[PDB]
């Protein structure tokens, strides 16, 4: 089997992207935030506190006549940007793009942090990182792809992100007519339940490449590019007038500056991010600082290749036995 599914980004600015996916009998349809850095599915729901709802779409298990209560299961996640949620847990039927997951669990939300409910476009969270990570207690559950793995033609699925414009999350195929040139495979750390590989190095603008290991994780629910602070230092220093800002919690720049690209590597392979794909808008209604797209890892303890990289390239997520990532011009 197969699935393709178009995946849009919620605002101008691509803070993030929703895919539509179908849960239950009959479908209930919810916006979901595919991320490859977390392992829950998890929606908002009949159940959730209903002063923490504000426009999103709700699951309601009492209306799918496929829905079972996972007695005793409990979830709790918190999220790197400090955002939470927790609830109980239903198994249902779950399609996304055509692609079918019977007793998949779908934990619906008893509560949320105000992040989510000020969101009113994110209806949940469908986590594509390892198992291991996944919240469910006492019984810990399988991701999508993780149920979906072996009736899939071959044991992958991939991202092709879209820079201010939709793009597709596939399972179970490699779509030859969606990059350019090759895919550069590389090597995948399981160890700590992320898509976790090693960049090469990188360069700024039309510099010369710097070649230097940079492990972190593929993260497609992280808006931006988080790398160590001399990587971003070299970055910054490129664009006059930029500078950290520790009220604001970040890398800013003038509103007027033409931004460089930005490289990485994957092995010998070379994956160049727009000057414009880094430019995040000004960090309030109309001021001319603007919010960068590149920014220190320091604080978070790992480095986060999040959309902004990945949406540069085409994105291949080789769930087989042994775990590989790909990368592709587009």
Do not use: M
Request: glycine content about 12%.
């Amino acid at each position: 089997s197969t699935g393709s599914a178009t995946t849009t980004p919620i605002d101008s600015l691509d803070d993030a992207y929703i895919t539509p996916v179908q849960i239950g009998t009959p479908a209930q349809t919810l916006n979901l935030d595919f991320d490859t850095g977390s392992s829950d599915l998890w929606v908002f729901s009949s159940e959730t506190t209903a002063s923490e709802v504000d426009g999103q779409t709700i699951y309601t298990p009492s209306k799918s006549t496929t829905a079972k209560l996972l007695s005793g299961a409990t979830w709790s996640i918190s999220y790197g940007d400090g955002s939470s949620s927790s609830g109980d847990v239903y198994t249902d039927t779950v399609s996304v793009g055509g692609l079918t997951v019977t007793g998949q669990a779908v934990e619906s939300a008893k509560k949320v942090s105000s992040s989510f409910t000020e969101d009113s476009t994110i209806d949940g969270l469908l986590g594509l990182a390892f198992s291991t990570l996944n919240t469910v207690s006492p019984t810990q559950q399988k991701t999508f792809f993780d149920n979906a793995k072996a009736s899939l033609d071959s044991p992958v699925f991939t991202a092709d992100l879209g820079y201010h414009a939709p793009g597709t999350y596939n399972f179970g195929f490699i779509d030859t007519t969606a990059y350019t040139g090759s895919i550069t495979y590389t090597a995948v750390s399981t160890k700590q339940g992320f898509w976790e590989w090693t960049s090469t190095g990188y360069a700024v603008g039309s510099g010369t490449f710097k070649s230097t290991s940079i492990d972190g994780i593929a993260d497609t629910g992280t808006t931006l590019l988080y790398l160590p602070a001399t990587v971003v230092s070299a970055y910054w220093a490129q664009v006059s007038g930029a500078k950290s800002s520790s009220s604001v919690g970040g890398y800013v720049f003038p509103c007027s500056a033409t931004l460089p690209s930005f490289t990485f590597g994957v092995g010998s392979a070379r994956i160049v991010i727009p000057g414009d794909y880094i430019d995040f808008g000004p960090i309030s209604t109309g001021s001319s600082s603007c919010f960068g797209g590149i920014q220190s890892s320091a604080g978070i303890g790992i480095n986060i290749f999040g959309d902004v990289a990945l949406k540069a390239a085409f994105v291949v997520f080789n769930g087989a036995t042994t775990p590989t990532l790909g990368f592709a011009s587009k």
